[PDB]
Amino acid sequence: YTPIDISLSLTQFLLSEFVPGAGFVLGLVDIIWGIFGPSQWDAFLVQIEQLINQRIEEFARNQAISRLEGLSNLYQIYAESFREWEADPTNPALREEMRIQFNDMNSALTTAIPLFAVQNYQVPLLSVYVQAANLHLSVLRDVSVFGQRWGFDAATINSRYNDLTRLIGNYTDYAVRWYNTGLERVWGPDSRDWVRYNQFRRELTLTVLDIVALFSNYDSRRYPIRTVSQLTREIYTNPVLENFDGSFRGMAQRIEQNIRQPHLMDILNRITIYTDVHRGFNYWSGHQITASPVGFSGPEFAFPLFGNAGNAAPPVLVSLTGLGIFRTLSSPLYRRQELFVLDGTEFSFASLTTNLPSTIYRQRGTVDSLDVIPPQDNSVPPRAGFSHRLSHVTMLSQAAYTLRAPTFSWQHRSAEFNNIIPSSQITQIPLTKSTNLGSGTSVVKGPGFTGGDILRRTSPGQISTLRVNITAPLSQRYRVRIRYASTTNLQFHTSIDGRPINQGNFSATMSLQSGSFRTVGFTTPFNFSNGSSVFTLSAHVFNSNEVYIDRIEFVPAEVEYDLERAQKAVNELFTSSNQIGLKTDVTDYHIDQVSNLVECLSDEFCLDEKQELSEKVKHAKRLSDERNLLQDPNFRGINRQLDRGWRGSTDITIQGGDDVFKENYVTLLGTFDECYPTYLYQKIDESKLKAYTRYQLRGYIEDSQDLEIYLIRYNAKHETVNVPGTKCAHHSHHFSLDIDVGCTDLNEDLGVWVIFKIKTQDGHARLGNLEFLEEKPLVGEALARVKRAEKKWRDKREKLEWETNIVYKEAKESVDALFVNSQYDRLQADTNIAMIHAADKRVHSIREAYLPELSVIPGVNAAIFEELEGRIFTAFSLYDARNVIKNGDFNNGLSCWNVKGHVDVEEQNNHRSVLVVPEWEAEVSQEVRVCPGRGYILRVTAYKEGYGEGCVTIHEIENNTDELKFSNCAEAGYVTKELEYFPETDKVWIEIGETEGTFIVDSVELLLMEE
């Protein structure tokens, strides 16, 4: 009945029945409180005092105690009330009485704990502090459960729930600082100062830390029902050294490494103990240990030979029988070349049913490990209640006297052999109960508040794997939680026997402390599909750079949580509860995605809650048609009306559904000639524009390349968008473009132009969920810039107008010089092709006939350009009529001519087509039928290149031979020469030859004269 026997006694009870209610509260009056006289408080103290020497002074010491007696009286008045409450939970006086006695109790500890964390005596009050602190957490959870049942408003409940989630941290971190700085100062070099060191570690690990580990279990709201956590940590004994009158100098660290290092928890299989001898006395020299992984789920382990084997006598065999070895009765031996060895050690195997036969090594002893490691329960004989069982034993040898002092590891019986999953509890698996460590994971040492060591990943992959045994429930469904501490963003995939069953985005938590390890859960449950399964955790999102993992939690769930999401989703679509309007920055796409969250819900369960949540969103979506200034944004009527709406190219496709799109979308193809792009343009009319207001064009691109996007009004506003599908790529998927409406005239209806355009051989795009919307009022600078870009558009409109007013009336003049009447019917006899051609330069100078960006879109001075370019074509038609010669323009290639050498033909600017004789040996004859004895003209239009002359002769069967010639004279722009010709027969041959170089001919015409 030392403070340890009783510490355990609590932990036993703490590990098992954690469930809230009266059961827990009176269970605290049964164990420690309402039973501890000041004697057993004083004794709690004398425990640590005498490990560290330093005594508490007889005031603080004297008032720590007189307080505790107080708290132990109060807690009677609180628990008694609570008991009587539970029996009649609705009596007003009792419920009231309960609020009185909670406030009193809460304020009790709030004042008291300072007196147990006193400066310059922190460490020796911890076995008290912990009890006090541990009591403070119980009563705070009690309000968190029973508050509004008692009376308090829900506000004082959360405020008390704050301070619960707070003091679980603060009471822990403090309980660890002072264990550390408590253990650090009791170190030293010799044998002794490992013994007093280990005796601190051991004892206070039992009497402060193991309670602290279970502080996490107090978060009412995280652990609502039963939960059973496991204490995986080990502790340490050495019979030889602990029971000895002597120190070996500077030897402590050598004993500190014979302690195994942070590892996975194994299960000892067999010891094989070798004997040896010195001066008659045989002894335990060294041993050979084997061990099997957790749940026997992997090949048995194997260490080297501890100590030295011996041939002096046979070995001795020790094999796992029951629940393990719970008690060593060892017998040292000290020959004061002196000797200090074990020479005999009984082992005994635990059970809750029968009394199994003990194995003795050489003899039974009188060093009981039940007064270093005492049991939990003394209602039963020690075959049960044992608390601990032998973990793994090592062997301490002297340097190169004889020393062979085995150091025994003891592990707690909360850390069970098998993993387990029952259904009326929440089962916590600390990841040290694995069977197979994933490559690139280490097992770092414990922080000191999770009864055991923890895992570390410092780069992506597989944490560990656990064998799972699923008990009472067959088809029960569970969520999973992961207690982790990470400096980086994460994901946490798991598998189960083969298939993944989770991916989650887990947040970062750090830069170590009890404010490190966060524990989030799945957003959908699963069910195990076999009795014995395999679970495997994995941290995947890249970065390194430091990830700790404490435990996997298996919490169960019944079959409405992604309904609270589909609720708030729909609400942030609006500006206010009246739901008249949308937020300016909620978008036609964004809205759809919310609408997908609504239908993927549950017909089965939340049928009514699904209906309203959709008739909202189908309404919110209706608002984003109403505000949308794009005419026909569902691409349902393209190229139907020449005034309003969309205009695109044939190479555009309008499917309605895609992996990515939930309504009509538009694919645009490439093009072979950049002078002819894919396009999809539109004019937002001025009827729909509000002066001095920024407007926005928006949408969503699945994939694209070479997509040009224009917003035009006063300027062009050109952006390219190269989005690859999920360095400088616009992989934003979204797009937005600004334009600012200065003034608002309706007589001009300038408006805004939208234009999508692709110009490349291997370009493409897919877009949809488009919109054009008012954004905000221009103000400050924006208003100054737009107004500058008003005037400076207007300064151009007028210089266009005056410049063009001249040019029409200069071009019209020049055009009619060709024709002979207002009716454009006949030409003039002395008008040639160079005049027609010179007249097209006067028309093609009009300028701004068409939009430079996209010649498709007609511009100002379209109708006037188009009519002059008409009469130019009109003129061309007549020149062909009058010409008796057949295809003299060379507009139909070299056809109806008789071609000899290597000639060819090419076209020029403005409806010109020009024969080219590129070598003198080339000829180009044509017969023409003429009228015997009339007046014909022959008119030729050509220039010459190189040396030599090129000559266009005319003759009949007999010698009526005339000739025209062109040369540069010496040694773009066509000379035109004519002559008057009269044939007496009806046939006449027009023949084109040249001397040398090249001869370029626009036209050989031949006229008849009627005057």
Side-chain angles (χ1 to χ4, degrees), residues 312-495 497-511 513-542 546-558:
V316 179
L317 268 160
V318 188
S319 295
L320 170 79
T321 311
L323 305 183
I325 310 165
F326 70 77
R327 186 213 213 173
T328 39
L329 284 172
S330 41
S331 67
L333 179 83
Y334 307 101
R335 289 302 88 181
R336 305 301 280 287
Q337 179 149 341
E338 289 177 342
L339 186 58
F340 324 74
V341 297
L342 293 198
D343 76 291
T345 298
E346 175 157 62
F347 312 92
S348 306
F349 301 95
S351 182
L352 321 95
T353 57
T354 44
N355 277 50
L356 305 123
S358 37
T359 320
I360 286 179
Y361 156 59
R362 228 195 77 233
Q363 71 206 14
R364 189 182 309 104
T366 75
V367 186
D368 213 353
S369 69
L370 298 197
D371 315 304
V372 159
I373 321 295
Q376 284 174 331
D377 223 9
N378 315 71
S379 73
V380 302
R383 323 311 138 173
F386 47 99
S387 82
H388 289 78
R389 46 171 170 94
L390 199 67
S391 133
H392 151 241
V393 53
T394 194
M395 243 292 326
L396 177 73
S397 295
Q398 84 300 328
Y401 57 73
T402 291
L403 178 86
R404 300 272 144 92
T407 321
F408 299 74
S409 308
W410 299 91
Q411 179 161 228
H412 197 237
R413 73 196 281 230
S414 64
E416 252 147 348
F417 285 70
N418 290 283
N419 291 359
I420 220 75
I421 315 280
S423 28
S424 298
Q425 58 164 236
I426 301 180
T427 314
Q428 304 190 55
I429 310 293
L431 281 191
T432 54
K433 314 208 75 209
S434 303
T435 83
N436 217 11
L437 208 76
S439 71
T441 316
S442 76
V443 176
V444 61
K445 167 182 42 174
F449 55 78
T450 50
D453 308 346
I454 65 173
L455 277 288
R456 190 171 71 188
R457 216 86 170 68
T458 183
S459 222
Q462 301 259 331
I463 299 289
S464 76
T465 199
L466 316 95
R467 202 181 230 166
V468 168
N469 287 284
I470 309 92
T471 53
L474 303 94
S475 66
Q476 168 102 60
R477 223 184 305 292
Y478 306 84
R479 313 188 185 235
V480 159
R481 277 200 307 238
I482 308 152
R483 183 170 184 104
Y484 70 102
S486 167
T487 56
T488 165
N489 285 322
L490 255 179
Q491 276 177 356
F492 267 126
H493 297 53
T494 75
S495 80
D497 278 294
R499 299 185 165 118
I501 64 88
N502 185 230
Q503 318 182 56
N505 273 111
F506 287 75
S507 48
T509 87
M510 257 204 322
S511 61
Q513 258 165 54
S514 173
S516 297
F517 300 77
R518 269 180 162 71
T519 314
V520 184
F522 289 8
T523 56
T524 29
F526 75 105
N527 48 314
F528 301 100
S529 25
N530 265 344
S532 170
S533 277
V534 181
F535 201 73
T536 318
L537 189 73
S538 301
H540 277 127
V541 164
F542 305 142
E546 195 188 8
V547 171
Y548 295 93
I549 326 83
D550 192 48
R551 55 187 173 240
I552 283 174
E553 278 177 50
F554 292 100
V555 54
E558 308 292 302

Side-chain angles (χ1 to χ4, degrees), residues 600-613:
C600 256
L601 280 188
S602 177
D603 290 338
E604 169 183 356
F605 283 101
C606 332
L607 184 50
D608 308 294
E609 297 120 297
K610 184 164 179 160
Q611 281 308 313
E612 298 140 18
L613 269 185

Side-chain angles (χ1 to χ4, degrees), residues 839-846 848-858:
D840 204 44
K841 299 210 170 66
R842 279 151 167 153
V843 167
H844 285 243
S845 36
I846 278 165
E848 260 210 61
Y850 297 116
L851 197 83
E853 298 76 64
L854 182 82
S855 66
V856 165
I857 288 161

